[PDB]
């Protein structure tokens, strides 16, 4: 949890968690109703994923964001 700025920074950061939480991709996309690959690509190349997915993840992640000055 710090001051973000890049797409890739959010990706690395999320896995940091999903994994360290024990959870994984295989199941992630199983619950929020998406595709495995999706989380997968998005994970490594999030520069082109969209925000509508950015959130579907935050759900199967018990996590979310907000803006900050």
């Amino acid at each position: 949890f710090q001051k973000i700025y890049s797409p890739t920074q959010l990706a690395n950061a999320m896995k940091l968690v999903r994994q360290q939480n024990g959870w994984t991709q295989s199941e992630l996309a199983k619950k929020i109703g998406i595709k495995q690959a999706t989380i997968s690509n998005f994970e490594n190349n999030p520069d082109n994923t969209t925000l509508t997915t950015f959130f579907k993840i935050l759900q199967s992640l018990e996590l979310s964001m907000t803006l900050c000055d």
Partner: protein
Amino acid sequence: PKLVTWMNNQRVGELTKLANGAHTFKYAPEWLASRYARPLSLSLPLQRGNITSDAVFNFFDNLLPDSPIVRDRIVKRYHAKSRQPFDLLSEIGRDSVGAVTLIPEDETVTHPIMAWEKLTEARLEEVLTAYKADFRISVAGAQEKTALLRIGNDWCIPKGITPTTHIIKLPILSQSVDNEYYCLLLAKELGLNVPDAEIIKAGNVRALAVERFDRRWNAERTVLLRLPQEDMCQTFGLPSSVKYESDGGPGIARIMAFLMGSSEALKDRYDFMKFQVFQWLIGATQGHAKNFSVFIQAGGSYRLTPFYDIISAFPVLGGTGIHISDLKLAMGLNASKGKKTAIDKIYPRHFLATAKVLRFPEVQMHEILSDFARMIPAALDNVKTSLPTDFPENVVTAVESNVLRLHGRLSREY
């Protein structure tokens, strides 16, 4: 002219009306600048300038009881100035579903912040008869009803800018109160979130009562408080008109898709579906946009509040004109053939596709579907024996008899 809306002693904003009769809006900076800020509905989120969209008018419309039945009674009993939304409110700005307070700019005064008057055991049968055929109350919905305060064993009346606590519905069909109670208790028996309802009696009137989750007594018990809430249709900002789907309102689809934004996304959905399967085994044909509300939290957050106004259309079955065959689910289903809604012929197979289309973990639906594959034979007697002797014993042999007919689709499987 400029009905200033408030939210629990907080100058939210001003609702102005132009000469031509326009329904605009503008938020007070004071409300902006707070860490808390939240729009009355996501239909009209925060911003720094007069609004103009239709929602500015819609949201306010759902506020006041939908029935023109009552509307006319409004201008009538209260010296209004038009059947227009802004007007009926201009005067009855006191009580309003959701944290709404409408009072002009000539009453910043500290009107009665807390005051009421207990009702006699007779007036409890009098005030009703008064609704059916400062009483500053307004309840939006289906037939003849209003809200009231409750303190211990009394039944006072909101006076001044003071809210209420309970809901009080009346019989319509041959019975309504008897149908509203029956359906609600079984909700707490199937893991559904519903309010605490009873059947307070007053002379010769079997009345209904409900606990408004929008109303909650703070710890201190020294001040009662409302809670900003709205129903789906409102969220976006639509008129009562398009309530039902076949008429152009939001459906199971738009819904779910909007549940994903919930601050509690997966639950609201889970339960939502669960409820859709329930409204199937009972014949709740009334499941529309103005029954599924959402709370409103700072910053734009929201979740799926308890489901209300629930009711089944099984009373007028069997030995009556309308039969279960013609009954149709409020919300549309996805089948192989366009959409299907005919409750009677709706097997899980369909629900299964649905969950499949909205991409809801099939297993998650199963857990829900399967849950109603063995809890009925029991869950029933559990609430069947929790009802007094006076309650009509012909509202149970009609609903249940049929609820176990469609239940076969679940028993012959799981």
